[PDB]
Design a protein around this nucleic acid. Sequence first.
RNA 1: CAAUAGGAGCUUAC
Lengths: 51, 113, 48
Amino acid sequence: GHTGKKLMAQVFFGPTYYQRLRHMVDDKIHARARGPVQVLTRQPVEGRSRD
Amino acid sequence: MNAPDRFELFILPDDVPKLKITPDSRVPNCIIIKFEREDHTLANLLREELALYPDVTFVAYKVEHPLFANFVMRLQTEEGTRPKQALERACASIINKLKTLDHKFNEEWNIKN
Amino acid sequence: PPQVRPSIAMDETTQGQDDLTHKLSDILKANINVQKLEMDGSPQHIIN
RNA sequence: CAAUAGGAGCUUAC
């Protein structure tokens, strides 16, 4: 695509049935600088949803 | 949520130049050009045009990262010639070739009717 | 101290004590029941 | 300027 030159090797090419799995990066990316702590231990809470 | 805008490929900011020239001091009479907001379309055209001149000794380009829309080009020339003038010469030559190509395509299309 | 056994909030107005607190309350009940036997009749099968 | 706990279940990557 960059140069239009033929590729020296031939490429296995055709349609294939692919699936969209439920694991998205935007449902997993999490960062925490400072946030809520636990009442008992005063340590960072557990959970992406809980920060 | 981290995806940049699809129009930053082509819209030039006001604080970002289109073109920036720095010299390569290691070898004589060589310059490094960074083209912002361009891609392989201009780069390959210019590279293969410049590579066929007698006075051009080195010419190359790369796109260091596909997620950023720029390329950098190294161009060296002989003692008398300046790489900048050769760059304008190549640009003008491709422009003239495209004009001739357009004229011939239009005449051919009219004749085909 | 209550730090070791803090209470918590379930739906914005309700609180249950920690296990240690209820255990201490049960111990206190047991203690007072002990103090209700050496003060009156206790036919030796309630003291034990 | 303050967003509960405990459990069970289903999953992710080794």
